[PDB]
Design a binder for this molecule. Structure first.
Ligand SMILES: OC[C@H]1O[C@H](O[C@H]2[C@H](O)[C@@H](O)[C@H](O)O[C@@H]2CO)[C@H](O)[C@@H](O)[C@@H]1O
Length: 380
């Protein structure tokens, strides 16, 4: 209280955000403290539940509907003049049940990043990668290496030929109809597991192992968001950001996320938070500070977006974003991501078959909302 504590994921520009916090503290005298706890996405509703935590919380829009549903976030009330400074579709990203629950920051989408030196020409397809790997393995390199621990990175493939989260119908998602176990999704996950079985990829490659490999030039390509371009710029690797490879002739459909800023409902500093977000962060000068630390992607602020338009990397992010679809923000998104995280890993580690893994994934009661027991509640 009387100050501002912000939580932002560790892969974002928290130091750039901290710089905005000093500009604020210089004007208001209010100390802004930026933090980046591990697993904050799930640590937040754990603490905020007890009326504890940060005043402002950053994270992609998909989790906000759940927080909103449990009364963990304060309703946003920007003046119409301010609302017109951001792109309309980004406001809809953070609109839960008709009420605004967060401030949009930037549009994010996964892209295919490759080393122009080892791979002067990026694979047009997913199918030609195993052939490309063997070529490079011979030279002592790899063709592809990305974070397999988070289904956010593997989804583009699973969705390319047909997989989907929830069936959007009648202006509303259907939680009983999940499409993670359909033919298109199985086709996609199967392909990824074959890569693993054929020793093209490691089942346990995470974000850091992958990043290090690409940055040190030990692998030809990687799949990552805009925030990753900074470490690569410093690694001095000659890279390129381009469209994700297609699968079965169908483009990869990543789940587009809108970086959002939400105010803790139990926050005494609500009006302070509003001043910081609207008057200091969401400005050309504010966004820049952050961007310079670690690129946001395609910022929602119209004024600063026009400047970022001339960046070829941003253009590619936009192309990939166009082929995918914005993540739903329904309360069930957390259960879904977990169900899929489990299925992808079970399938990847051979603990389960793809058909078995995905099936159990679409039947998770935590996503469906119900369960039909074999017997019932009684006793004889
Ligand atoms: O792996 C499932 C998670 O995917 C997304 O998380 C993204 C986030 O949108 C993005 O801003 C950040 O840079 O990367 C993470 C993936 O590590 C969802 O938004 C999460 O809710 C899911 O748990």
């Amino acid at each position: 209280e009387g100050k501002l504590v912000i939580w932002i994921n560790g892969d974002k520009g928290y130091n750039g955000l901290a710089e905005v916090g000093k500009k604020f503290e210089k004007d208001t005298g209010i100390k802004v403290t930026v933090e980046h706890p591990d697993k904050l996405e799930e640590k937040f509703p754990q603490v905020a539940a007890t009326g504890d935590g940060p005043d402002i919380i950053f994270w992609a829009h998909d989790r906000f509907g759940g927080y909103a549903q449990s009364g963990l976030l304060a309703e946003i009330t920007p003046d119409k003049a301010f609302q017109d400074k951001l792109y309309p579709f980004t406001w809809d990203a953070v609109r839960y049940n008709g009420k605004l629950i967060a401030y949009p920051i930037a549009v994010e989408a996964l892209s295919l990043i490759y080393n122009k030196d080892l791979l002067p020409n990026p694979p047009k397809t997913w199918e030609e990668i195993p052939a490309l790997d063997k070529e490079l393995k011979a030279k002592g390199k790899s063709a592809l290496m990305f974070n397999l621990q988070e289904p956010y990175f593997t989804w583009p493939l699973i969705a390319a030929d047909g997989g989907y989260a929830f069936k959007y119908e009648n202006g509303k998602y259907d939680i009983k109809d999940v499409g993670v176990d359909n033919a298109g999704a199985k086709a996609g996950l199967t392909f990824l597991v074959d890569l693993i079985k054929n020793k093209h990829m490691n089942a346990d490659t995470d974000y850091s192992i992958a990043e290090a490999a690409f940055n040190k030039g030990e692998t030809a390509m990687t799949i990552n968001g805009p925030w990753a371009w900074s470490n690569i710029d410093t690694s001095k690797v000659n890279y390129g950001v381009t469209v994700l490879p297609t699968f079965k002739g169908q483009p990869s459909k990543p789940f587009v996320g809108v970086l959002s800023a939400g105010i803790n409902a139990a926050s005494p500093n609500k009006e302070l938070a509003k001043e910081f977000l609207e008057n200091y962060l969401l400005t050309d000068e504010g966004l820049e500070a952050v961007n310079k630390d670690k690129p946001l992607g395609a910022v929602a602020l119209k004024s600063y977006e026009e400047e970022l338009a001339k960046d070829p990397r941003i253009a590619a992010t936009m192309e990939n974003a166009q082929k995918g679809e914005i993540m739903p923000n329904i309360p069930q998104m957390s259960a879904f991501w977990y169900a899929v995280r489990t299925a992808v890993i079970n399938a990847a580690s051979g603990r389960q078959t793809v058909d078995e893994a995905l099936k159990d994934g679409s039947q998770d009661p935590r996503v469906r909302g119900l369960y039909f027991p074999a017997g019932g509640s009684e006793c004889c």
